[PDB]
């Protein structure tokens, strides 16, 4: 069986297809016309994009495939180091950090972070309470303020104070430039070219900004001895049950940088896509608003109250079905194997899981796959294995899934409790692609229900 392949550009093969502002969306269109699998070649590089549950069910077999670092995350590693997201499974510090960090990311551990998530959520609500009549809300911009600040507070008890400023904290500024520089290197034909020599100076400066701040807070915390409810405390007190060793101060720094990279843009995008689908689907918004009002009976939401926001949780999952904000992940074959009984792979062959296309597999979801219907998730046990993968797969799945969903349910719950929303511009969906997806330019007007918090 020979594999489909999109149009080629002579000696560049398929690489110019990714020289665009919206690569994932272009890859989705390629998948529409070529089907569940297609070969994608580049100068000295070959991968295969998978879109169907039948094949991705096999790619998620951990005995046959392990996480691969895409070229994007190899560049990100220049400042995320061997934190969890940019380390290979076989690296000593992956398993060690995984064993140490896993209990601090459980559903149960969310009880400890709850109060500090509420702290930033109340700031978001009060900001919107304090808008004048004419004014509107820049949704992704404000959601990103919240998620950066929430990860800052719960990650290492640091306040970026994003709601007090127009230009973000220098760390946030340096991190976004670093991610941006790592992204631009993907489509950069000439290395070492002097036009980017300043890009390299800025990169090294941005790395130092990030490292200086994180190393100082770690050092300050070690001298202090203070015990807080943050991940930094757990990392300073944790030991790997396997090796018996703790994480050293450098890898702890890479973990903190990792949480901010991995968590802030994905969770921001989810809240923004969720609010977008709600205003485009007023019957769903009303149903979710009715739940928010019924459950959140106190001025400040409790951890137990957030767990009762079931429909809000279904809204978040349906937003993740349509636009998973971390839209692709890479795998490699551990040994020679046959995929789907018709595609032979050699040891080391790479695969890409195109999550937005998986989530549109009509044989799983039916024919209305493009419709926003959270009720698709009223009985999750009916969904076949590996059909819904917004948080990746296996031991290399998202360690922050419970943190992300608890924050998003908390924040969207309070939003629906406190405001009615207006799609005052009839916003047309425009999905900007960094390494993550978000709706660009999405704006709304909020009218307060005047409920004290
Ligand atoms: C809100 C939506 C989020 C989505 C959709 C998401 C998505 C993902 C995905 C798809 C992966 C697997 C990547 C791969 O296979 O290469 C991953 C891994 C990871 N995520 Fe998340 N994420 C979210 C939020 C967060 C948050 C809040 C945190 C931390 C506070 C976080 C931290 C991580 C880390 C550390 C890993 C690497 C795990 C490992 O390999 O050991 N993410 N995430």
Is 398 labelled a binding residue? yes
The resolution, in Å, is 2.2
In a mutational test of the pocket of ligand 1, which residue from 266, 268, 350, 409 has the highest number of ligand atoms less than 8 Å from its CB? 266
C-alpha 94/C-alpha 276 separation (Å) is 36
60 part of the active site: no
C-alpha 162/C-alpha 142 separation (Å) is 9
**Which candidate in 38, 60, 398, 403 is catalytic?**
398
Closest CA to 333 of 59, 88, 70: 59
| Number of neighbouring beta carbons within 10 Å of residue 297 | 10
391 part of the active site: yes
436 CA distance to ligand 1 middle (Å): 11
Rounded (10°) CA dihedral 391, 393, 396, 400: 20
For 368, phi then psi, to 5°, come to -90, 40
65 part of the active site: no
Q: Are the C-beta atoms of 266 and 436 separated by less than 8 Å?
A: yes
Rounded to whole angstroms, what are the CA distances from 181 to 124, 213, 328, 332? 29, 20, 20, 26
Residues with CB under 6 A from ligand 1: 67, 84-85, 98, 151, 258-259, 262-263, 266-267, 270, 324-326, 329, 390-392, 396, 398-400, 403-404
Atom of ligand 1 nearest to the CA of 397: 12
Domain spans of the chain, in order of start: 1-453
In a mutational test of the pocket of ligand 1, which residue from 154, 262, 355, 405 has the highest number of ligand atoms less than 8 Å from its CB? 262
Atom of ligand 1 nearest to the CA of 405: 1
Contacts of residue 165, defined as CB under 8 A and 6 or more positions apart, other chains included, come to: none
Q: In what order do the strands lie in the sheet with 328-333?
A: 37-42, 45-50, 350-354, 328-333, 65-68
Atom 14 (ligand 1) nearest CA: 329
In a mutational test of the pocket of ligand 1, which residue from 398, 399, 411, 435 has the highest number of ligand atoms less than 8 Å from its CB? 398
Is 158 labelled a binding residue? no
**3-class secondary structure per residue, the chain:** CCCCCCCCCHHHCCHHHHCCCCHHHHHHHHHHHHCCEEEEEECCEEEEEECCHHHHHHHCCCCCEEEECCHHHHHHHHHHCCCHHHCCCCCHHHHHHHHHHHHHHCCCCHHHHHHHHHHHHHHHHHHHHCCCCCCCEEHHHHHHHHHHHHHHHHHHCCCCCHHHCCCCCHHHHHHHHHHHHHHHCCCCCCCCCHHHHHHHHHHHHHHHHHHHHHHHHHHHHHHHCCCCCCHHHHHHHCCCCCCCCCCCHHHHHHHHHHHHHHHHHHHHHHHHHHHHHHHCCHHHHHHHHHHHHHHCCCCCCCHHHHHCCHHHHHHHHHHHHHCCCCCEEEEEECCCEEECCCEEECCCCEEEEEHHHHCCCHHHHCCCCCCCCHHHHCCHHHCCCCCCCCCCCHHHCCCCHHHHHHHHHHHHHHHHHHEEEECCCCCCCCEEECCCEEECCCEEEEEECCCCC
C-alpha 127/C-alpha 163 separation (Å) is 8
Atom of ligand 1 nearest to the CA of 73: 16
**Which candidate in 259, 377, 391, 419 is catalytic?**
391
401 CA distance to ligand 1 middle (Å): 7
Atom of ligand 1 nearest to the CA of 231: 30
């Amino acid at each position: 069986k020979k594999m489909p392949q999109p149009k080629t550009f002579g000696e560049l093969k398929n690489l110019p297809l990714l020289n665009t502002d919206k690569p994932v969306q272009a890859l989705m269109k390629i998948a529409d016309e070529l089907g569940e699998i297609f070969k994608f070649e580049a100068p000295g590089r070959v991968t295969r994009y998978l879109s169907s549950q039948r094949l991705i069910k096999e790619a998620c077999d951990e005995s046959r495939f392990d996480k691969n670092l895409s070229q994007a995350y190899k560049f990100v590693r220049d400042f995320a180091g061997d934190g969890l997201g940019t380390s290979w499974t076989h690296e000593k510090n992956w398993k060690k950090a995984h064993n140490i960090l896993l209990p601090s990311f459980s559903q149960q551990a969310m009880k400890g972070y709850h109060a500090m998530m509420v702290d930033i959520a109340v700031q978001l609500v009060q900001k919107w309470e304090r808008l004048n009549a004419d004014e509107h809300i820049e949704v992704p911009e404000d959601m990103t303020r919240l998620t950066l600040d929430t990860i800052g507070l719960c990650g290492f008890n640091y306040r970026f104070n994003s709601f007090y400023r127009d230009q973000p904290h220098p760390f946030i500024t340096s991190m976004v430039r670093a991610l941006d520089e790592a992204m631009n290197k993907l489509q950069r034909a000439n290395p070492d070219d002097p036009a980017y020599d300043e890009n390299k100076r800025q990169f090294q400066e941005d790395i130092k900004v990030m490292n200086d701040l994180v190393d100082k807070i770690i050092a300050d915390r070690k001298a202090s001895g203070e015990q807080s409810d943050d991940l930094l405390t757990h990392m300073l007190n944790g030991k790997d049950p396997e090796t018996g060793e703790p994480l050293d101060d450098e890898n702890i720094r890479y973990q903190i940088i990792t949480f901010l990279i991995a968590g802030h843009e994905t969770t921001s995008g989810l809240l923004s896509f969720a609010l977008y689908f709600l205003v485009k689907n007023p019957h769903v918004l009303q149903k979710a608003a009715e739940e928010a009002a019924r459950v959140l009976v106190d001025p400040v939401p409790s951890y137990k109250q957030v767990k009762q926001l079931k429909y809000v949780g279904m809204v978040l999952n349906e937003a993740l079905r349509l636009w998973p904000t971390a839209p692709a992940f890479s795998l490699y074959a551990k040994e020679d194997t046959v995929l789907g009984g018709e595609y032979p792979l050699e040891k080391g062959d790479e695969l890409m899981v195109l999550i937005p296309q998986l989530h549109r597999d009509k044989t799983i979801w039916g024919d209305d796959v493009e419709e926003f219907r959270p009720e698709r998730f009223e009985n999750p046990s009916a969904i076949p294995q590996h059909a819904f993968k917004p948080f990746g797969n296996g031991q290399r799945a998202c360690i922050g899934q419970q943190f992300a969903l608890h924050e998003a349910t908390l924040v969207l719950g309070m939003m629906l409790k406190h405001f009615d929303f207006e799609d005052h511009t009839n916003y047309e969906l425009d999905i900007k692609e960094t390494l993550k997806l978000k709706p660009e330019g999405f704006v709304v007007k909020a009218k307060s229900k005047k409920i004290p918090l």
